[model samples]
Target: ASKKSVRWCTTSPAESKKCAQWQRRMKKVRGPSVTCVKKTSRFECIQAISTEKADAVTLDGGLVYDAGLDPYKLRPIAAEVYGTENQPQTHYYAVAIAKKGTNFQLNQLQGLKSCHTGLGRSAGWNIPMGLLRPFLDWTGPPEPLQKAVAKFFSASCVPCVDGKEYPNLCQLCAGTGENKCACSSQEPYFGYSGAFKCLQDGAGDVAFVKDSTVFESLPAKADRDQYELLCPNNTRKPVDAFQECHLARVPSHAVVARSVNGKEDLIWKLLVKAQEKFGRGKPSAFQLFGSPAGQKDLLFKDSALGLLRIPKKIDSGLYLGSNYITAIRGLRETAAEVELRRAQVVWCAVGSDEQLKCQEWSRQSNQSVVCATASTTEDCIALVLKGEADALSLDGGYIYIAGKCGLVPVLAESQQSPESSGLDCVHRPVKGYLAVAVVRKANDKITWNSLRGKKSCHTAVDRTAGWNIPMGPLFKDTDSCRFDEFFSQSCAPGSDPRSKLCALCAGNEEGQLKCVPNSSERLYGYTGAFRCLAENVGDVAFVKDVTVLDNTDGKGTEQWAKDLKLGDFELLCLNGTRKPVTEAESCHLPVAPNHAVVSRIDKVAHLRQVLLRQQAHFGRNGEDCPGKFCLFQSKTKNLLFNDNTECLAKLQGKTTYDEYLGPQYVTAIAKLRRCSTSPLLEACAFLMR
Candidate 1:
């Protein structure tokens, strides 16, 4: 009557019987009552919980990942701890094992034969494949992930990897008569020891396994020196260096409950009391963490030491993390799964304020558009590559990098003001935007060449207007490599936070998140750089011409910008003279490519469809417009997408980044790359091997 009872779901008769013994013992306890609900399988238990016929069940990290999706939408409530009492962890390390004589590093896994414990396994399939994903060379859709893996590793043995479709994947296995590369124990090359044997027998150059796999076998009292771990940073260390070389940590099994109302406290209390009498190694009948002799992992894992409550912020994705989720996605990236993933559109937003705008759009669009966030543009681009996010709009400079990384442009940012030639937004003539350098009219004595020694503001390094265009002319004129020495001081967001380039940037009102390439920084982005000038923080601001118009007179809505006059702002022309903002067309930096949306080829179609549909409700001409929600307008100024966006205009057949950005700009960015580097560019180039 006090609601102290927790209905625990059990998958098997052995587990159900054990649950009853635990249930009967609860009455003798001070608090918590227990009742058992039986389901034939873990899948059935998940459905039972979804249908509200059950309260909770314990699930492996992988199963919980699935349960978190679709109808169940479960969350991790408590995690099981393992290892010695001195330092039990809720996770284990997944590592790459190779013979000491192997002539390769982690980055050179391409064209090398490999061994995996089994398909869809944590230590084997999930991690090692994830660690080598850049080299897998498959970007989803009709070309399967496994087929690419088969080609990447010249020959290998991966249990349950469909020998017929990818026969090369089973080439190294020694099993016979339908047991070749089998998923079960029938295949001798099917597990940790088997994978190690595949590498030890010289069938493959490396083996994917858990940290303890090598230590437990191979007469490990002394044979550890014969093997080494391949670190992600392309270094090799003794097998004992597993902690430093593993790909990622696999999270522990946890008790899961519905994301909706569930008796988490009650279930937790029941567990606390249950373990008091029937926990691991306890001298008690009907053990909770023990099995009858040879029967393994009955009610709970035999290795579980105790349970720790998972925080409310802990969802399966956050708990499982990226590499694990990406690996599982790689295992069976079928058309149906791809179709399901496509049904929902995930938008990658940079910066905190943009994330807020995206959330509003998500709600206004009935949550069909979900938001994935990262602090910088390149991070968002990498997210699209990893399939964590769908797409993001970027300046031309970043388009070159995204092109190098294999992401393509989808749509261009068309200007709202049309010259005499009127047509459909898609059919209209497309033109480049003006990159203008704005300064306070009060300064009265500044020109293009005389701008050094003055504090400046920028939209962030690597941006078209902020960095690329502004720095190029200076680099050619002065032959200087260090902009830090040239500018004296600036608030260019994506530079070293400790450097002079970052000294002028102010963070959010709290002033903590400074120098980050995100919206939380009070002085970032077009509007932010404009704000830096409006607040009198910087003498010159490198921004688009429209930025000044958008923030001046009656348009600039921030508290600091409210009383500002448009005439107070002027632009620095390349002719060494200052002019009115409206004269940008006659006197400006290189006509840069308009910011455009970019995504992986697999999602470009879905992205275009969802964006076209979503904007109808939230775009500039949205049905509800400013009444309900407007994608182009925001209180915080330029949130997720740009506040000035008229519509997500069509790319007009300019698909690839090279085609969309034009050759001149692409080569300009290429020249700039010698000064600045993207870490993931070579990561994929290594795959080009």
Candidate 2:
């Protein structure tokens, strides 16, 4: 393959000129070369890099955070160092500034006119707003922060605020109409120098900016002496004395590249060569660090001392640091947008088919419920943790795992009759289901205690009735984790296939299913496990009591169950005996609670409201429902919620993980967890912290 030239994205003609000159100089010196790509603005450059039109671009700390999200998942490839050559620093200070004669202290900033560099920029909006978030009356999910800021500051010039939605915020901005609150330098008061100008020109009472803004704007001692810093402690100091008067220290900007095919090595090579030849004090016709006479820091910051190569493993979050990432995440959206989003319950769906049905649900619900998809249930849980998704219906086993991660149960599946509760069905107490060991009547020799070397089938691993409840007793009796050895041959989805745990699994026509946990496999869930036993592939099946009843006789017309009868199967009692399937109440394993809807604690109330309303419209007996849009029914396996669910019962007083899973059940899970080191268990440990 031929070596392709690297493309460097530049925001301005001045930056482009400098890049072209450096590229030419590099070719003459037998160094890595680059093709300079000009973009109208920094945001345009970011877009170019995302589309592969350019290989890399230097971005502000705030923009870098945005690039790390969604469509473009770029990471910082190199960081620009600030300060003196001997004491190169990777951080900068955000300070609040006002005229020295302004008697108002930090605590008395209410109703004052304010100026910001841009809407989502680091120093201009994030640092100042985040520091004052508490005082702004931002109680979460109902108010927009932009409106809060608009209310807090009577009148303000937030350059990038949407003029149509927040005219008051942009009332003092120099730009008119659509140009108001632009993300770039289009607005007259849109950047560090511009924001200070907004204050110097008396358009704003105070300016939120970086420490160097005043220094760069007013070089004279007399002009600099007229400004003062506002500290968060209600104290004031000279503008030059920002070391003790700053709001917060923030990470510096850096050049970013895609995580893959980013030309990271080539870009690093070019930067190192260019800086050595055209750095701050280097004698060269073109200076990479110097800007044009009128513009400051065009291609690279003129004050930047050096560029440091970012380690390969350093991602955008690691390079930017947690504080900066948190600040940016908080600043990226307004209260209205967030609250509007909060109005809808975003359910996380796993796999393609599940995601498609979720989309249908979203559409049918009139957008009251939205959907976010992940490849697996674990990934969906992670999405909930990150606030990308609001809720997910999880099994008893995963509900426990979610609780460990600080998620709380919103509702549990209730099989009780509608008349069981005095109030609505949602207020009913759930009796749960019995875990049964089912065997064909012909296999009368199999008993729970004598099942050591028998072939077995299971609903799925990590399932309450199928695996946890059954294995909980087995693990206690054997005092070991070698389940594969205990069961001579078995079909336990989500277990090691080569270890006989999946030996009896009947995959689809593609022969693709092997230890798959979802319905994609032919022999996976409760119905499939029963089907395995009906076909004589396994001696016994561990499943819910309803599993055999739901599939036998004429209820299940599939080839495997067409001739099967409820009388043909018996329960393998825990006391080394067998009983009719109807005797599961006394012969079955421990009763396991039904699956529940799990969500982050913060969204519990809203999610409950949305779910209740949705159930009213799509519940099995809902007056307004059609068969296709039912909430709990599934054509194959359980989806967001179980098909057998009668109604979503309230969680009673159980809120936390330990509270809902019960002391005994939680203890059993803990004992079982101590014996395994799966990635899921490891992640649960990480999330608990």
Candidate 3:
């Protein structure tokens, strides 16, 4: 920032000349010092600034994303204003302009000729191609998206396109000789005005351009209204309705500088000073927004009204918005990057307890296992959707929520009993586990029928065994979502403390933490729910079937279940019959899917491979277990994965959440979600929507 000179990178000879003139004028006016560094293209300008050869340069929204990649680490320091001075806008819309009498909508333009401003321009290609990606029938990455677009349209005039590579893409080019399909003005159809001309002259059916391109091209309103915009909803509207019917509202070209030590403050100060002296309509010796006759858009957009310094927090991704960023990323994807996905298995851990386990795994895996943390499970799901995190293991309740967000299941946490000691972890048959209703053997009167107004014990609010399984069928027929009236004075860890559900929850061992969802709460997980019943605190306990076996018959490490024998407990058969815990095969309520890992489709193979491989080394019988730390066992119990997890097993051909959790479970949670929704769930849904 203390540097006295600002070096600006210019793209062409004309721009370099313009920068030199501006530099000389700034010195004559006793303003900040300036220097011009020449480059052949905007991409080279990005590289020059990134390498500290130049201080700053302006880039389009799509190229802004490219500059923000790992190689450059640049941030947008300022943006260009494009609209009228009174109603100035720092953004523009990427619209699909079509002739009014074409009788074709956005969806029906598959076989029609098209005109793009250029190959990779934001409005002309990136935004429109991203929006129409689905209709192109192109399986991207494996087969380049350009090939699909070439065949989708019968013929087109996309400037900068290689005629030899895709003949159809440049078939409509009217330029003669070497000027054909060139990126410069040498080709008559190379920009917003040029693309519109291509449409006006009947060279193409649809023109991809900005909102103001039509009005700027034609002086009369009558000539402008002859064209319409193709909307995303398969409808066409007047060009002025671009606010409601455009491909995407992209951010304007921005001045980019290195994130580390670039002189953004000085650069911003120089721009403000320059605009005040030489902006549009200003009575100055030189013009900042105007280019020489026959030369266009030098240094900045000639259409720009002025410059506006963006806030410090507005990075390239935040500036472009998530949907636009996704659009940009969609075009840049390559099938060759699956190995990168294999290298980065970033696991999302929810809560402080889960993060504790995640950090240990990250370190134990020699940093191969990356960790991403969030405060809640819903936020963890949100992280996976954004690629901030790769995968996370979840119960069936949350697994459904992630599936709704378009995530897939990769592996299942199999708590297989004594039979699978030396079996193949990936090939082992996973028949799921039992979600049972347990009451103390001392209480002979409490059965599956007519048990009302009793203090109940549940692990968490949304888990299949604890709340969803019982509540889904118990209140399954009822239209109303009132369940607290059914079980009074109960202890559900995830419910509000002020409600009756949390009345009996004991916080920590000192009895001070209260009813919370984390491990700090005494009555939280499957093991904790059994504690509530064993201590005579609740009439019935909702828990996993093995929750009793792990903590009973003198095998229990906790003092609460140390002296408790297996004969002291019993299970409810759902048919009003009571039986012993060993008879759970016939007495259990439902066979709930075990805890499984969920991730984007790209990470499915890598997640399964890394998890299965790591568990073999850190598993219960792992060679490094008890020495380097076990992957399944945590001191806090079920911190990230289940404490009793035998191994992270394969999920067979069931790659989808619906198939993994089954339709009954998926639809069952869908019902509870339909009636009683979570703000975090709805917030994630609407944002993705």
Candidate 4:
């Protein structure tokens, strides 16, 4: 028991097994490690699991030992499924450890209280602070707890009088997992645990059962009194207690009902209101940092000056933490040193091979170590805090609110920290968004907007140019707003001046309410990674750049550029800017080539996030579509610089096309423009960055 106390130590994977076995062996004898475990206030664990592979195999602490790998003093624990002990594994993984001691617990809890884990999950509870405190404070052993327990009962699967185990006495509800509420509504609350109650009279108590969907949803009430009523003999409380703390923190009445009929929605709304009341007081602002993925162009560009201009007074700026050797070299060759020095670069490169190239680039360019690499965004942030890197660069602008609470905004134009004594110099040519995700069009059937409640697939969250930057902007829109609302109300749908309608891909796939999946890459790759995520073969697939064989020339194999599109797909494009308002520029671009289309639920969420993010997507005009940095295509050959160019075309006539065709077609003919410069690519960058 002494060894249970939480302690922080980076254990070697190579030595973890011997350490685990030794601890297990010593624990029986109450040795130092065992004593530490017993006395440890909390436990922290980490397991590398795929976020997109639900059934993919992974190595755990126990498995590491079984494989002859040493625990190396790392805690040895076995893998357990979220909903069941033997159920299939979901790819999502959380890496965090618990700690011990009174001060540690209090401090941990204190820290937790302030952090918000967006997906409706609370971030700040000392996991050790069970529902006991709140329940005791509220003095409830009555209806509140009872109601919760009853609700849990409604969702539980228990044995009926027929000796069959199910959510409800009937098979229909049991199969659907939704009949528990229906059955429980007809049963008596006082029924015995194993009683064979029958609702044949529609009055008899429907038998009570245990809920297994989530180990804690049923244990929302705090303390033993409530815990006993809901889960007798269940010791999942101290855990449940803290979870209640999380629920307590959630914004109450924040759950705005799509309709006023839902009880859960009502409860969620009230909960949100309660949370707001509880957190009514404002606190001091502080500087927080995020490592932007270079691969994610939106994060990198959006986090900086952003789509919406920062008031000159605001001084908001973003830096890329990820290194961009090729991009930097390109800028150096094309732009002036003074210009690059005047840019606010926040990109970071990890310790991979990308760093070495950056080192060489830095040496040649007379840059500092900040231009190198970081193993993690956290690490990059450490540099920012320590003043190594002045600005944090991300590939996506998904996290526009990051600087809101306390940090001041710094534009990409002000390359160096204005606050840094007198050292004022930054990088310029400030690269606009340039990230992208690819998908195969023919395989997926549904459009992107339909993926409201689906899971997304990716290799890792840290690969900036590849992942995080794209995710940052995509995560901008909290769940409160709708996709169309995000576009129409927030980002403003079309280009400008009498443009008819916005939203590049629209069909009410999200019922015109929420977002649907659009990125084809996310559709096919992670089936085992997430459940309730479905796709039709011709409707869903992974988005990636693949070379297809082209037989246009009779004797040779040449690859012609092509794009994937289906009935239910939407493309988001990057690489276009808002048309100049004073210059009388065409409202729509003659050539729009970049775009992304929604193909699945996950993609829908991603697109929604992109659209709703005011800082990243919405422009200063509040009229131009948010994220105008990307473009779209009217057809394969016709790249529409503006999303609504086709609609705007009616206003301009063929003459406008003729005037634009010469320059646009010349660029196309000379092959000066790659697929990346198109609106389709820009849309992909919008989300993928």
CA RMSD of each candidate after superposition: 14.1, 13.6, 12.1, 27.8
Residue-level lDDT of model 4, residues 1-689, one tens digit each, is 21222221113332233223433543443433311111111112222111110111113222222221122212111122222334432112111112111122222222121110111121111111222122112223332322222222223222222214222322212213433223233322212221212221122222221222123233343322222111111212332233211111110000011111212222233223322322113131210011234322110111211111111111001111111111122222323432343232333444554455444434433342225357764454334422235343221121121121111222222112123322111112112222232223333432334333322333222333223333333333343312222212111112221222122222233344211232222211122111111122222221222111111112212221123122122222223222121221232112211111111111122222332232122222223333232212212332211222211111112111122222332232223223113332232222112
TM-score of each: 0.50, 0.48, 0.49, 0.20
Displacement of the residue 563 alpha carbon in candidate 2, Å: 23
Question: Candidate 2, clashing residue pairs?
Answer: 144-335, 144-336, 145-335, 159-181, 160-181
Best by lDDT: 3
Whole-structure CA lDDT of model 4: 0.23
- The lowest-lDDT stretch of 10 consecutive residues in candidate 4 is 250-259
> After aligning candidate 4 to the native by TM-score, how far in Å is the CA of 91 from where it should be?
40
- What local lDDT does model 1 show for residue 595? 79
How accurate locally, in lDDT, is each candidate?
Answer: 0.77, 0.77, 0.80, 0.23
Angstrom error of the Cα, residue 329, model 3: value is 5.4
Name the better of 3 and 4 by TM-score. Answer: 3
Off by over 4 Å in 4: 1-349, 352-355, 367-374, 397-689
